Design an enzyme around this catalytic site. Structure first.
Site, mmCIF file in Angstrom:
data_model
loop_
_atom_site.group_PDB
_atom_site.id
_atom_site.type_symbol
_atom_site.label_atom_id
_atom_site.label_comp_id
_atom_site.label_asym_id
_atom_site.label_seq_id
_atom_site.Cartn_x
_atom_site.Cartn_y
_atom_site.Cartn_z
ATOM 1 C CB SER A 169 32.027 29.909 38.260
ATOM 2 O OG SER A 169 31.981 31.307 38.475
ATOM 3 C CD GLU A 206 39.528 36.909 39.068
ATOM 4 O OE1 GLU A 206 38.865 36.524 40.054
ATOM 5 O OE2 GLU A 206 40.775 36.970 39.070
ATOM 6 N N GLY A 226 37.252 26.681 38.057
ATOM 7 C CA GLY A 226 36.866 27.767 37.183
ATOM 8 C C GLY A 226 37.158 29.132 37.783
ATOM 9 C CB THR A 227 36.763 32.502 36.320
ATOM 10 O OG1 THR A 227 35.431 32.368 35.806
ATOM 11 C CG2 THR A 227 37.761 32.214 35.208
ATOM 12 C CB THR A 228 36.570 34.001 41.582
ATOM 13 O OG1 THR A 228 37.492 33.010 42.052
ATOM 14 C CG2 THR A 228 35.761 34.536 42.756
#
Lengths: 242, 218, 243, 233, 250, 241, 72, 82, 240
Positions: free
Chosen positions: C74, C46, C29-31
């Site tokens: 996330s 993010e 996943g995204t940070t």
């Protein structure tokens, strides 16, 4: 786990797909929806002369102006037939009016599109998956004469001339030509007998073939054996001249 | 394709036809088709049709195949890799063989579900004969052969012996009459009479089949 | 082995593979990062831009708890919203009986028992997301990240996602910048720079900077979104440092 | 893959992404294709109606939910009916309690939470039908793209179904065109016809297979068919 | 494949006998050796306690519990399996009897109700029956003294002298070896100490050995006086300090 | 194999699921010591020191059930926090229905029978954590009840958790034979912490700092955990002896 | 590389069309370019235009053929 | 190249070619009996033409009537079910 | 294969469990019946060859449902008794509600529904026993004969047989019975019914049980000597 595991999934559900072969094993039923009426017919499939064709009936009457037919296992049909008759008297209860053919078909398919015991936002009745091929045809004050095939798999489609059963594949090829928007009520009766005689495994007779008509004036009327035999002789007389 | 047991189903049916057809009986053991050596499969199959491929005064008979009839998926679990390529050449020798029917290939095994669909080749083999349980009229024909030699009493006819018949087709009717003639030797007589038939059949029908098929499940 | 086919089964390694696969699924996943200051906490998420068809201020993943707690996770987007929507009812359930907002260490116990029990249930699928929540309660600023395995502890900074390796090195530098920690406005400019540094693996796609924080100084204990000149200042501050 | 990981919805994968959801998305790929786009003051959806054979009539894929809202169903038929009555109940529940029509951003959160409960629960079949929902509320026109996993993403416009890339390519170059058109509902519908035309392989070009629905600040959500949509064609 | 280890929960054993019972009796065989002796004037039970760590308190482990003052019990097997069984077994004796007949449950009714819980565990799927075997000894007015061996399969039978645990087969002959039905209770305790001593030679003292007796009522354990009608407790647990007194006199 | 995934009995009588329960307790490599004094009970747990991004105050291996009662858990974290929530619920409900304090003898029995309830549930996974309950009883005084993840609890003179538990038990066994008592001297509860840490360092063989340890203290009608400044104060007094 | 060897109009975007390919090795991509030329014969074209690549690359080739547009 | 099962049109073109080599009745119709049989392999289609003459020998007819092809197909349906 | 599951339809369109339930019928007792113009006759085979069995305390195979409606079957009796109890409760429930006597058509649709409901219920085993429901309609002399199959369907027949050697007796029912002119007399319908039973019974008396239903709610049970009387008349034609 045999058929629910070993398969390599393409994103399909093989539970109902196995029932698709059972649909083709049912009785052959052909019908045509015209502007002057809807002529329906089925096949009795008598394996022995001791079978009573008048006692058993493969067509049911959901409404006075709306008929129905079935091809498949009768066990899975009786749950849908009683559910279709329940939705018919339901519209006659709250709104006290004859329900439309398309409106009734969608209410009947509500049970055919749901399966399983547990649920979240909708009640459940049947405890296991099922299916039946049902042809819903009738007449109303909205769209007139309409014919819908009730499929437990997907959403029902509107067919002017629909054929179900083992001979469903080849009969639709003949319905792409002989069928026409100008077919009258008398021409539709002789057209079904010409197609039904070929697709049926047995010989044409009043006992092994039962047809019915759907109109506005007479509502749901079933052709008597004597009346059917008169239409059989008219088909043989036409084929003799050709 | 034949079904049954050796001595009745897979034997009597094979030898009875060669008599009326006036053809030489040619027997090939099903296990001999596979010699456990690569290349002996297609070689021995072509030599069978070669002996019968000149004047064709014979018919090919093969019985009791527990091996080449099942190739499985591999060389284990009863199958073998040489069986896979042997059954294919037998198909080419079956289609390439052309005559008016003077020579036939009769093979009998327990189950055809493990056979190669290639060797099956619908239209080359139109005959599937499954073993059936004969009726009481079958016993009357087997008794009439032995009763022509062994003399029977006037109070016992063909309808008396056929009364009690439990799951026996053609094989043990001769074996049951063997005990019927053996008991008469104890009484020192060469002609079985009414007193001997009753005591002999009781020693036969009893104390043989331990498992009981019965309707007491209720 | 067959330990992954049955949920809530002890593996030979001590932890269920499905629980281990849920932790590794968070890295895909995204940070999302975070900074815990003295007067409050700062959150930075993010979001990868799929295409130019995206409308700003729509897909924002910032989640709210009461007025004093912000929330971000996330992992799978549909799986994370169900955990937040349940936590919204947990904060309201405490508000009904005790007639007071829920503190942060109490908010972690409700979501803790909620997730940890599902890891103990076979009929319920465990969560594959890692939720980061924090704010200022009556007891002051607190920050906790809920791991998909069910374990959580107080964090002075939060790091997760794919760029968590590059982000963890920058979060440890906060002690080197100042011994007492950066201020509320200084943490927004600092948390933004970490997003650009963690974007080196995501440089093949675009991004939209989204930052939210809650403190007692400016917002006076309220959860608001960074806009105006404060959002543009944190962007230009990091673009000059990466030169 | 056969058994092993991702054999059940609860069963995970070594990577961590469940492939059973991707299998439900495969039915959307060859399903009925639909194209849609929206402006500030208007929203347009163009869906293709499918059929069995020539005798089989085309069925409308656009289903009415709220007076100011609309949606298109591309995917499994039985799964799309339950989610339809669920949104119909939430619109009436919001009008009975909150007196306000169901918000688009609120409809996406309830729709995401609805399909998520059956996903995390053992057994059952998750919803594999795609939903493109438009609506007009106090916040304006919005278009949500519902994936079979439950992901919700706001876009100006998108397309799903057979050859969905043809319309996506058109929406990228024309992105700056239809967003600037305001008060002209005819130009937004003409852009939708040219968008699906590049996507279609020219199976059936007739009028009866295209169903165009539009909603705006003045005209509410209305499904047009026959000669109503034949003016743009 | 092989059997799935069924209790007949959802599936009957194809072998004709349940295979996991022997594996549950393996858990019974896993237990300590526990014996009992049924005599005319009393019934004595003897058992050994696991030492485990040397710093573990021996007074915490009680392998002989108190159901009714006239009926004792001793078990061999897993620790928590006995607690869940008896916590439910007590409520059965209270509701089905003590809340109806308002007296102390006799020997015939109490032992039967304990086996019914094991019967429900075998019948109800998903719940594994507990693998502990209980030796219940009691004295009532109707049947008098009784000693019953409760198996996890749901069957119980009376025994003059019987043993359970690892020494179930070994000590059963050892009890018959030195003891006969014509012997009284006093000579039975000495036999119980000699037989149980052969189980482990490490420590024979009262710390790792829990010895209990059933016999004439003790007025010190009744807790009250003034009522001649109510009988005193017929079960008296021997203190570890008093157990060493029987060891020196052994 | 399927026989290793089932909670019910094995062919050899050794449950594979239970063997993984004790195996998961040593996954964290935490060494805790629980001893009994005269009028007081002091338990010290090893505190792992992470990087600067974690709050050491929030990190704890000891949970407070109620006054005078405390629990240290060594094992999987997700099953450690949920097990503490069950012990607190049964502690408050027992002080209402029966209106009396819940002793560690019963408090270890409820969680032991509760673990067997989890084994009877197919969907529910049993607790794989060790529950060590310590308190000061009104009658029995200091008592230690350590509940195994399989639901085994028995009183202890001195106990520990870890790979060095065999070395800790042996070192404390010979020390108790010299004084012939299982209680620590210096009835003052402040000095009991000194010896409990002293006997732990000699048993483990490694000296720890203030952040490496968390010292729980259970007194009469009071329970508290020493903070970083209080633990550091103990190390200064232990260094002088 | 396969496009530079074959005769094209240089109107093809290799980066955009590669988005439809999933889990294809170096050998499986060779069969995809061969299918792109087979579409030209079905469309009645002597050469292979841009519209022929879009139809054959987006369709899954040499992996699995999914013919199911309906339920089950 | 994978071999699939021919359709009704494929079975009709094969039967009319074999009907020239084998003696058949001038009034038979292959559009019916072949339709009653589901999709079958090309090897089983030649079996229908060969088995049709076997029932004609039992019926003692110089050609194969419509009832002869019906018994040949039912023999294939009962023994194969493909 | 597919015998482990029920709701699975299988690629053959028929559940193998129903086919295996028919195998128990193939080994079941022979149940033959024929309806005439003025009467209906139902025969059955109960084996008396088992030694040490009292026939007085042995329940009959034919179960009385209504006054003018009886019930006959072949198969496992343990499964039929449940179907018998559910039918009898509904039989009394018919007069408990409609006040009319039990209708043959309504009773068959209920028994078919009982076969249907327990089949449509998950974890419930369907009945593999075929039952024959016969009788006259209320205020009607027209004979009604219905059957039940494990597939969950029902059908009407003038002459129908089930159990062991059902195909052999079925050939006797088609050739020697004319639907156009059923036997008018009671003796002709009973005598021809015995001849169908003498094939499976093979010259026996106590192994044959026939219950003839007459109009106006009349049930008669032929004794052992009365049933053997029809056997003697049939043997006269074979020995001639």
């Amino acid at each position: 786990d045999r058929g629910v595991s070993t398969f390599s999934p393409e994103g399909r559900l093989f539970q109902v797909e196995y029932s698709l072969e059972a649909i083709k094993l049912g009785s052959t039923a052909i019908g045509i929806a015209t502007k002057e009426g809807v002529v329906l017919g089925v096949e009795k499939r008598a394996t022995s002369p001791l079978l009573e064709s008048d006692s058993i009936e493969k067509i049911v009457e959901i409404d006075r102006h709306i008929g129905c037919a079935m091809s498949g296992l009768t066990a899975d049909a009786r749950s849908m037939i009683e559910h279709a008759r329940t939705a018919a008297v339901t519209h006659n209860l709250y709104y006290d009016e004859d329900i439309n053919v398309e409106s009734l078909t969608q209410s009947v398919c509500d049970l055919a599109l749901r399966f399983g015991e547990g649920a979240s936002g909708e009640e459940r009745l049947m405890s296991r998956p099922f299916g039946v091929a049902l042809l819903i045809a009738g007449h109303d004050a909205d769209d007139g004469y309409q014919l819908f095939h009730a499929e437990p798999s997907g959403t029902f489609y509107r067919y002017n001339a629909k054929a179900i059963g083992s001979g469903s594949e080849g009969a639709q090829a003949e319905l792409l030509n002989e069928w026409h928007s100008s077919l009258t009520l008398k021409e539709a009766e002789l057209l079904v007998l010409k197609i039904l005689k070929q697709v049926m495994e047995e010989k044409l007779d009043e006992n092994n073939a039962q047809l019915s008509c759907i109109t506005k004036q007479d509502g749901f009327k079933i052709y008597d054996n004597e009346k059917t035999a008169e239409l059989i002789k008219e088909l043989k007389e036409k084929e003799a001249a050709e | 394709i034949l079904y049954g047991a050796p001595g009745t189903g897979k034997t009597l049916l094979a030898k009875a036809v060669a008599n009326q057809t006036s053809a030489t009986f040619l027997r090939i053991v099903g296990s001999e088709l596979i010699q456990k050596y690569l290349g002996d499969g297609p070689r021995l199959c072509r030599q069978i049709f070669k002996v019968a491929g000149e004047n064709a005064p014979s018919i090919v008979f093969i019985d009791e195949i527990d091996a080449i009839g099942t190739k499985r998926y591999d060389s284990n679990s009863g199958g073998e890799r040489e069986i896979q390529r042997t059954m294919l050449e037998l198909l080419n020798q079956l289609d390439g063989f052309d005559d008016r029917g003077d020579v036939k290939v009769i093979m009998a095994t327990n189950k055809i579900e493990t056979l190669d669909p290639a060797l099956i080749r619908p239209g080359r083999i139109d005959r599937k004969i499954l073993f059936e349980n004969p009726d009481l009229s079958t016993k009357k024909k087997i008794l009439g052969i032995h009763t022509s030699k062994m003399n029977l009493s006037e109070d016992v006819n063909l309808e008396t012996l056929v009364t009690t018949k439990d799951d026996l087709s053609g094989a043990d009717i001769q074996a049951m009459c063997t005990e019927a003639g053996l008991l008469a030797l104890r009484e020192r007589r060469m002609q079985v009479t009414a007193e001997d038939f009753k005591q002999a059949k009781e020693r036969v029908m009893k104390n043989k089949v331990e498992e009981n098929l019965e309707g007491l499940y209720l | 082995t067959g330990y992954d086919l049955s949920n809530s089964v002890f593996s030979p390694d001590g932890r269920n593979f499905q629980v281990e696969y849920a932790v590794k699924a968070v890295e895909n996943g995204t940070t999302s990062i975070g900074i815990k200051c003295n007067d409050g906490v700062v959150f930075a998420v993010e979001k990868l831009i799929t295409s130019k068809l995206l409308v700003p201020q729509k897909n924002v993943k910032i989640q709210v708890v009461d007025r004093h707690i912000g929330c971000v996770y996330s992992g799978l987007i549909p799986d994370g919203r169900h955990l937040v929507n349940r936590g919204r009812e947990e904060a309201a359930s405490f508000k009904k009986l005790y007639k007071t907002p829920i503190p942060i260490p109490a908010f972690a116990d409700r979501l803790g028992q909620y997730v940890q029990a599902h890891t103990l249930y076979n009929s319920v699928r465990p969560f594959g997301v890692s939720t980061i929540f924090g704010g200022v309660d009556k007891n002051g600023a607190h920050l906790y990240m809920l791991e998909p395995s069910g374990s959580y502890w107080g964090y002075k900074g939060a790091a997760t996602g794919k760029g968590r390796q590059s982000a963890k090195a920058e979060l440890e530098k906060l002690v080197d910048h100042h011994p007492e920690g950066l201020s509320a406005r200084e943490a927004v400019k600092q948390a933004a720079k970490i997003i650009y540094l963690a974007h080196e693996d995501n440089k093949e796609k675009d991004f939209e900077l989204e930052i939210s924080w809650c403190s007692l100084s400016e917002t006076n204990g309220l959860h608001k979104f960074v806009k105006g000149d404060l959002l543009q200042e944190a962007i230009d501050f990091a673009q000059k440092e990466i030169n | 893959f056969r058994n092993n990981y991702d054999g059940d919805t609860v069963t995970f994968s070594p990577t961590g992404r469940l492939f059973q959801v991707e299998y439900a998305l495969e039915a959307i790929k060859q399903g009925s294709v639909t194209v849609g786009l929206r402006s500030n003051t208007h929203a347009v959806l163009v869906a293709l109606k499918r059929n069995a054979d020539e005798l089989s009539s085309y069925q409308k894929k656009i289903i009415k939910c709220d007076e100011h809202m609309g949606l298109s169903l591309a995917g499994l038929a039985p799964d799309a009916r339950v989610l339809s009555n669920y949104l119909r109940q939430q619109c009436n529940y919001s009008s009975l309690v909150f007196n306000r029509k169901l918000a688009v951003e609120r409809a996406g959160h309830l729709l995401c939470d609805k399909a998520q409960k059956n996903t995390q629960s053992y057994g059952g079949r998750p919803y594999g039908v795609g939903l493109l929902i438009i609506g007009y509320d106090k916040s304006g026109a919005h278009l949500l793209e519902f994936q079979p996993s439950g992901n919700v993403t706001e876009l100006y416009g998108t397309a799903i179904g057979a050859r969905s890339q043809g319309a996506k390519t058109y929406l990228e170059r024309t992105l700056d065109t239809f967003i600037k058109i305001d008060g002209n509902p005819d130009e937004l519908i003409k852009a939708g016809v040219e968008a699906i035309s590049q996507s279609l392989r020219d199976e059936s070009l007739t009028v009866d297979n295209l169903s165009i629905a539009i909603v705006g600040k003045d005209t509410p959500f209305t499904i047009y068919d026959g000669e109503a949509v034949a003016k743009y064609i | 494949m092989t059997d799935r280890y069924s209790f007949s929960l959802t599936t009957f054993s194809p072998s004709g006998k349940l295979g996991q019972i022997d594996y549950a009796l393996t858990a019974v065989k896993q237990g300590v050796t526990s014996l009992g002796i049924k005599a005319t004037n009393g019934v004595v039970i003897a058992t050994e306690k696991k030492s485990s760590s040397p710093l573990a308190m021996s007074e915490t482990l009680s392998k002989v519990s108190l159901l009714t003052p006239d009926i004792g019990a001793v078990y061999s097997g897993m620790g928590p399996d006995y607690r869940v069984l008896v916590d439910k077994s007590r409520k059965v004796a209270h509701t089905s009897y003590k809340r109806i007949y308002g007296e102390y449950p006799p020997t015939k009714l109490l032992v039967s109700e304990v086996a019914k819980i094991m019967q429900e565990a075998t019948q109800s799927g998903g719940v594994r029956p507990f693998g502990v075997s209980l030796l219940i000894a009691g004295h009532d007015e109707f049947n008098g003294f009784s000693l019953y061996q409760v198996d996890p399969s749901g069957s119980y039978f009376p025994w003059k002298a019987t043993a359970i645990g690892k020494g179930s087969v070994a000590a059963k002959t050892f009890l018959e070896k030195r003891w006969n039905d014509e012997l009284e209770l006093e000579d039975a305790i000495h036999i119980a100490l000699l037989t149980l001593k052969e189980s482990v030679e490490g420590e024979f003292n009262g710390d790792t050995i829990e010895l209990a007796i059933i016999g004439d009522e003790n007025p010190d354990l009744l807790g009250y006086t003034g009522i001649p009608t109510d009988k005193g407790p017929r079960f008296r647990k021997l203190t570890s300090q008093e157990i060493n007194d029987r060891l020196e006199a052994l | 194999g399927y026989d290793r995934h089932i909670t019910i009995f094995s062919p050899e009588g050794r449950l594979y699921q239970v063997e993984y329960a004790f195996k998961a307790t040593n996954q964290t490599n935490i060494n805790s010591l629980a001893v009994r004094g005269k009028d007081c009970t002091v338990v010290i747990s090893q505190k792992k020191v992470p990087d600067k991004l974690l709050d050491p105050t929030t990190v704890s291996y000891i949970f407070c059930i109620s006054r005078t009662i405390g629990m240290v858990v060594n094992g999987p974290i997700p099953d450690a926090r949920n097990a503490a929530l069950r012990a607190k619920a049964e502690a408050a409900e027992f002080r209402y229905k029966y209106g009396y304090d819940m002793p560690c003898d019963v408090l270890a029995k409820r969680m032991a029978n509760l673990s067997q309830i989890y084994t009877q549930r197919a969907y529910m996974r049993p607790l794989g954590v060790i529950l060590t309950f310590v308190s000061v009883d009104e009658e029995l005084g200091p008592s230690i009840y350590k509940t195994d993840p399989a639901g085994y609890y028995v009183g202890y003179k001195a106990t520990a958790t870890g790979p060095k538990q065999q070395e800790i038990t042996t070192n404390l066994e010979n020390h108790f034979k010299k004084s012939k008592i299982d209680h620590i001297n210096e009835e003052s509860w402040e000095k009991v912490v000194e010896f409990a840490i002293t006997h732990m360092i000699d048993a483990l063989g490694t000296e720890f700092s203030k952040n490496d340890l968390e010292v729980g203290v259970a007194t009469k009608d009071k329970f508290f955990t020493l903070s970083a400044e209080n633990i550091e104060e103990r190390l200064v007094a232990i260094a002088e002896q | 590389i396969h496009s530079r060897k074959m005769t094209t109009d240089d109107d093809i975007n290799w980066q955009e069309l590669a988005r439809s390919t999933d889990e294809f090795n170096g050998a499986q991509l060779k069969a995809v370019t061969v299918e792109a030329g087979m579409i030209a014969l079905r469309n009645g074209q002597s050469s292979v235009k841009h519209e022929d690549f879009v139809e054959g690359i987006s369709e899954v080739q040499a992996r699995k053929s999914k013919s199911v547009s309906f339920y089950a | 190249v994978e071999f699939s099962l021919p359709d009704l049109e494929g079975r009709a073109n094969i039967f009319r070619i074999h009907s020239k080599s084998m003696s058949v009745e001038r009034g038979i119709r292959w559009e019916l009996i072949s339709r009653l049989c589901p999709n079958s392999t090309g090897a089983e289609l030649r079996s229908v033409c060969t088995e049709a003459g076997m029932f004609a020998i039992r019926a003692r007819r110089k050609v194969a009537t419509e009832k002869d092809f019906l018994k040949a197909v039912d023999k294939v349906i009962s023994g194969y079910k493909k | 294969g597919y015998d482990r599951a029920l709701s699975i339809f299988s690629p053959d369109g028929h559940i193998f469990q129903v086919e295996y339930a028919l195998e128990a019928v193939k080994r079941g007792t022979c149940a033959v019946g024929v309806k005439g113009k003025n009467c209906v006759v139902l025969g059955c085979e109960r084996r008396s060859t088992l030694k040490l069995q009292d026939t007085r305390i042995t329940p009959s195979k034919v179960s009385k449902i209504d006054s003018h409606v009886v019930l006959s079957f072949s198969g496992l009796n343990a499964d039929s008794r449940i179907l018998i109890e559910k039918a009898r409760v509904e039989a009394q429930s018919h007069r408990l509600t409609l006040e009319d006597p039990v209708t043959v058509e309504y009773l068959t649709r209920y028994v078919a529904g009982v076969q249907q409901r327990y089949t449509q219920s998950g974890g419930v085993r369907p009945f593999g026993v075929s039952t024959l429901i016969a009788g006259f309609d209320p205020r009607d002399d027209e004979p009604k004969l219905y059957q039940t199959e494990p597939s969950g369907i029902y059908s009407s027949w003038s002459a129908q047989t089930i159990g062991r050697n059902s195909k052999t007796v079925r050939e006797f029912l088609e050739k020697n019975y004319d639907r156009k002119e059923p036997p008018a007399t009671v003796e002709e319908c009973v005598k021809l019914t015995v001849r169908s039973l003498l094939e499976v019974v093979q010259t026996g008396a106590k192994n044959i049980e026939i219950t003839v239903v007459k109009p106006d709610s009349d049930i008669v049970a032929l004794s052992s000597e009365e049933i053997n009387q029809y056997v003697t008349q049939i043997e006269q034609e074979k020995q001639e």
